[PDB]
Amino acid sequence: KTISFNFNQFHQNEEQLKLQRDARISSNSVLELTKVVNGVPTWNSTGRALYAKPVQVWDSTTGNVASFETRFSFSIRQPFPRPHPADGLVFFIAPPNTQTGEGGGYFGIYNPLSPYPFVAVEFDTFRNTWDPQIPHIGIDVNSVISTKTVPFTLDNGGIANVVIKYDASTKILHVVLVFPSLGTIYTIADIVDLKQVLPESVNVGFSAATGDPSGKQRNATETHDILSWSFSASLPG
Amino acid sequence: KTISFNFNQFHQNEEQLKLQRDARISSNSVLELTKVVNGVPTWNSTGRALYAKPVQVWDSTTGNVASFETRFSFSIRQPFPRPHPADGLVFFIAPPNTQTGEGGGYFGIYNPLSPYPFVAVEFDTFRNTWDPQIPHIGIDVNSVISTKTVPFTLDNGGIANVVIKYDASTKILHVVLVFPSLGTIYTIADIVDLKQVLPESVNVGFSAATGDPSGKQRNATETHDILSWSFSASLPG
Ligand SMILES: *[C@@H]1O[C@H](CO)[C@@H](O)[C@H](O)[C@H]1NC(C)=O
Ligand SMILES: *[C@@H]1O[C@H](CO)[C@@H](O)[C@H](O)[C@H]1NC(C)=O
Ligand SMILES: *[C@@H]1O[C@H](CO)[C@@H](O)[C@H](O)[C@H]1NC(C)=O
Ligand SMILES: *[C@H]1O[C@H](CO)[C@@H](O)[C@H](O)[C@H]1NC(C)=O
Ligand SMILES: [Ca+2]
Ligand SMILES: [Ca+2]
Ligand SMILES: [Mn+2]
Ligand SMILES: [Mn+2]
């Protein structure tokens, strides 16, 4: 089976998408994961967007695990340079029927008081105690304490292109981040066996968070917009 | 609501119980959680016994959480005093349809690669890197790194009586361990809010494991028998 879908731009009322929390689709065809009021991003926000149908990542019957490729472009604009923007966005795969986890440095996917399995790639903008120098991309398996990290220099307000490919044969998850206006290229990879971590069917989508009010700094925010998104996966057996 | 059950001793073919892995009920009416062949407890063992029907620990419509009490007697016999007996047993509450996680110091409940929520009381006999002096009673919330612990001196081969009470009105989980032959009393308590951790309906039961072959020490074993077990829960709403 080969599932595929492509969004060159999002539209309002889109059937194949499931918005959660603050996430909404603007008139301009941009998916804003977090809250922006008349051009200014707000703190204390969290939002997610999921493809409305689950995809089969592997089969128990055959033991085969699906390969997949996903591509998307995003934009993170940081208006208040000081004291520190927050928190970041992530592409994630998690079991179906899940609710938004905690925000902040958890991105709306990780809840320490009610854990569930998840694999996710993060573009992190705030340096928590469990984090290395920001910004950095990170591969996360069940936790926000990344297995692998690589720092990057954000194109503030610019466009970022991302390619994430998973090869069943090698169990390699490889991630590409490009900032076209800047010419910069960032690469990061790790072995992840989707079978020992996730159930047969999952949900794919994005999650983002802006500073938590418990920080007392309202200038800890930024936008987390998605411009386009396509996904393809193949399960032989 | 008020579910209630009691086992003075276990009878083979017990319909209200649900054994998993190595766990089994012997002729003498004892429920042996881990493997013992002709009186000799063997390493590399993991077993679980769960009550057949799921209990409702809380209500979303009303917001009411249940109070419960459970009492049981166990026996841990350590035939090989050296190099070190292992690993222990636990009473635990987890989401329905759970699967026997990792053995060893994870007691057949925790599974790092595929987390799920659980609340448990362990009686730990092996000192892992995350553990303090053994043996000790410990309260576990979603992980084997206890929130609160207390040490105890085991009556090797003897009978232990345990009382576990949860008061919804205060979220106090209180634990009592008595070794009758010795006259010793160990007590431990912590604040635990079942609503922030578990779903409305869970499964209640026991789990135990003997040393893992990864330690390369066949002597890291002991018995983990359950003599009797009563349980009462009351959900006002
Ligand atoms: C932050 O947002 C959450 C959910 O939208 C709300 O509970 C909270 O009161 C909001 N405001 C502040 C200042 O915390
Ligand atoms: C230990 O026991 C398990 C389950 O019975 C088995 O699969 C494994 O190969 C055993 N290994 C050793 C060294 O005993
Ligand atoms: C294993 O236990 C037996 C019984 O006490 C003992 O004779 C043997 O040499 C022990 N092995 C170690 C490493 O202590
Ligand atoms: C926050 O952002 C505004 C807008 O840039 C700036 O004038 C202010 O002093 C910044 N610093 C803090 C600590 O809020
Ligand atoms: Ca962070
Ligand atoms: Ca231990
Ligand atoms: Mn991070
Ligand atoms: Mn312990």
Residue B61 is given by DSSP the state T
Residue A20 sits at the chain B interface (C-beta within 8 Å): no
Which residues, other chains included, contact A33 with Cβ-Cβ below 8 Å and sequence gap of 6+? A22, A23, A47, A48, A49, A89, A206, A207, A208, A224, A225, A226
Are the beta carbons of B196 and A112 separated by less than 8 Å?
no
Q: How many inter-chain contacts (A to B, CB under 8 Å) are there?
A: 32
Ramachandran assignment for A113, one of left (phi > 0), alpha (psi -120 to 50 degrees), beta (any other):
alpha
Substitution target from B102, B113, B116, B198 for chain A, most A beta carbons within 10 A: B113
Residues in chain A, how many? 237
**Minimum-distance CB partner of A114 among B113, B114, B117:** B117
Shortest CA gap B196–chain A (Å): 6
Nearest-CA distance A22 → chain B (Å): 22
Asked if residue B43 lies in contact with residue B210, where contact means CB atoms within 8 angstroms, the answer is yes
Q: How many whole angstroms separate alpha carbon A122 and alpha carbon A174?
A: 13
Does the beta-carbon distance from B115 to A112 stay under 8 Å? no
Q: Which atom of ligand 4 is nearest to the CA of A219?
A: 1
Residue A71: phi and psi, rounded to 5, are -140, 140
Q: What's the Cα-to-Cα distance from A157 to each of A27, A145, A179, A184, A225, rounded to whole Å?
A: 19, 27, 11, 15, 10
A65: which DSSP letter? Answer: B
Q: Which residue in the set A112, A114, A196 is minimally distant from B113, CB to CB?
A: A196
Task: Report how far ligand 6's centroid is from the alpha carbon of A213 (Å).
Answer: 38
In sequence order, what are the beta bridge partners of A87? Answer: A210
- Cite the beta strand spans of chain B per DSSP E: 2-7, 17-21, 24-25, 31-32, 36-37, 40-41, 46-51, 55-56, 67-75, 87-94, 119-124, 136-141, 148-151, 160-167, 172-179, 184-191, 201-210, 225-234
Q: Which ligand is nearest to the CA of B150?
A: 8
Resolution for this experimental structure (Å): 2.3
How far apart (Å, rounded) are the C-alpha atoms in residues B2 and B222? 36
CA dihedral B97, A106, A67, B98 (to 10 degrees): -10
Which residues constitute the domain of residue A167?
1-237
B115/A contact by beta carbon, under 8 A: yes
The HSE-up count of residue B69 (CA atoms within 13 Å, CB side) is: 4
In ligand 3, the atom with minimum distance to the C-alpha of B81 is 5
Give the gap in angstroms from C-alpha B68 to the nearest C-alpha of chain A.
Answer: 21
Measured from CB, residues less than 6 Å from any atom of ligand 3 are B 80, 82-83, 219
- Method of determination is X-ray
Nearest CA in chain A to B198: A114
What CATH number has the domain bearing residue A41? 2.60.120.200
Cβ neighbours of A61 (radius 10 Å): 8
DSSP of B161-212? EEEEEEETTTTEEEEEEEETTTTEEEEEEEE--HHHHS-SEEEEEEEEEE--
CA nearest to A69, candidates A138, A172, A160: A172
Asked if the C-beta of B16 comes within 8 angstroms of chain A's C-beta atoms, the answer is no
Q: How far apart are CA A69 and CA A175, in angstroms?
A: 10
Query: How many domains are there within chain B?
Result: 1
Q: Which two tokens stand for residue B192?
A: 């635990």
Q: Do A115 and B114 touch (CB under 8 A)?
A: no
- Max CA pair span of chain A: 54
| Local structure of residue B27 (DSSP, 8 states) | T
* Cβ atoms of B139 and B175 closer than 8 Å: yes
Contacts with A198 from chain B: Cβ below 8 Å: 114
3-state secondary structure of B233: strand
Q: What is the CA radius of gyration of chain B?
A: 17
Q: Do B115 and A117 touch (CB under 8 A)?
A: yes
